[model samples]
Target: MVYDKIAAQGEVVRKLKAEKAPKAKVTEAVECLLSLKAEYKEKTGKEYVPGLEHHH
Candidate 1:
């Protein structure tokens, strides 16, 4: 779940920003993203990066 779940939520958060969701709402999701990253970054060997995930 760590791999794809974060990716999926990343899309959801981007959608929130695309729709201009309230800053607080989007940031709330962002904070959660960061929280997940902290948990997975080390385990995933930090695979996430700009444009790199395009490979997935």
Candidate 2:
């Protein structure tokens, strides 16, 4: 599911934040991973990857 990827990504980002990375870095990382998820849904017509929320 999109939420799963996002939650997973958020954990990574929070860890990065704990390491003192800038907000821009965290934003960039989240954006990139979310974009991939979005693209995969767009191409596959399978929103949510089994556990994710539908792309809106």
Candidate 3:
């Protein structure tokens, strides 16, 4: 479930990169995801490991 959000945000970042968005803008988007991760950790007391490699 959490990975879904991360992947969605990652797609947005990819599109932004393809459109040549400013570095600051890209950084802002990425930071948003990082903040989400931090919030998840705060609530669940666990880290978010994104990607299929970490899956069972």
Candidate 4:
């Protein structure tokens, strides 16, 4: 399901954010995640909420 991919992407982004030297990757991941969420919305007829994306 789309949910798993989006969730996995978040982990990738999260790990990169903490690992350092992934400034470019961090932003890219975030942008891509947003894109997926956008697509998810188009198909799901509702916005997808990240489990802990903004927990910070």
lDDT of each: 0.54, 0.55, 0.54, 0.59
Best by lDDT: 4
Estimate, for each residue in 3-54, the C-alpha lDDT of model 1 and write its tens digit.
Answer: 5555556667668779777666566656555555556675554744311132
| lDDT digits (tens) for residues 1-56 of candidate 3 | 44555556655765787888766656655665666555556444344443321211
TM-score of each: 0.56, 0.44, 0.51, 0.62
lDDT of 3 at 31: 65
What lDDT score is found at residue 2 in candidate 4? 45
Best by TM-score: 4
> What is the alpha-carbon lDDT of model 4 when measured against the actual structure?
0.59
lDDT of 2 by residue, 1-56 (tens): 33455456656766787888877767765664556456556544433243222323
Worst 10 residues of 3 by lDDT: 47-56
Backbone steric clashes in candidate 1, count: 0
lDDT of 2 at 2: 37
Candidate rank order under TM-score: 4, 1, 3, 2
Judged by lDDT relative to the true structure, which candidate is superior, 1 or 2?
2
CA shift at 33, candidate 2, in angstroms? 2.5
